[PDB]
């Protein structure tokens, strides 16, 4: 199918393998692709990325986030209705109340 996402940087564009994408974030009306070594902008929506990203690795976990389960370090029940994801590079990502069942069902816990 496809195996790289092209992030927009200030001067050029950087092809990043899917394997190096940690998460994607909808923020300030754009999609930010957060890769291990850089961050950049993409024109596709999170809805479009859900179609194109491999469903074995990537999961919509919040209206504003797609996470790569291979960069998840730990999953915490931060409150009674949500999760908080500890990423391998120290970042955190929320699983919202509205995605929390889908998230845990798909991940099998």
Binding site for a copy of itself (CB under 8 A): 1-6, 8-9, 11-15, 17, 42-44, 56-57, 69-70, 72-77, 86, 107-109
Q: How many CA atoms within 13 Å lie on the side-chain side of 56?
A: 2
Q: To the nearest whole angstrom, how small is the minimum distance from the Cβ of residue 6 to a copy of itself?
A: 4
- Return the H-helix or E-strand segment holding 50: helix 46-52
Q: To the nearest whole angstrom, how small is the minimum distance from the Cβ of residue 63 to a copy of itself?
A: 22
Q: Do the annotations mark residue 88 as ligand-binding?
A: yes
Tokens encoding 100: 């929390």
Q: Say how far apart CA 91 and CA 99 lie, in whole Å.
A: 19
Q: To the nearest whole angstrom, how small is the minimum distance from the Cβ of residue 47 to a copy of itself?
A: 15
Residue with smaller CB distance to a copy of itself, 8 or 94: 8
Residues 6+ apart with CB under 8 A from 72: 85, 86, 87, 88
The annotation places the binding site at 72, 88
């Amino acid at each position: 199918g496809k195996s790289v996402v092209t992030l927009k940087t200030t001067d050029g564009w950087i092809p990043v393998p899917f394997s190096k994408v940690m998460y994607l974030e909808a923020k300030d009306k754009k999609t930010y692709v957060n890769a291990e070594e850089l961050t950049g902008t993409h024109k596709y929506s999170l809805q479009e990325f859900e179609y194109l990203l491999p469903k074995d690795s990537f999961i919509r976990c919040h209206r504003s986030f797609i996470v790569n389960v291979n960069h998840i370090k730990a999953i915490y029940p931060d409150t009674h209705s949500t999760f908080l994801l500890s990423m391998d590079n120290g970042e955190r990502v929320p699983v919202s109340q509205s995605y929390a069942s889908y998230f845990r069902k798909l991940l099998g816990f």
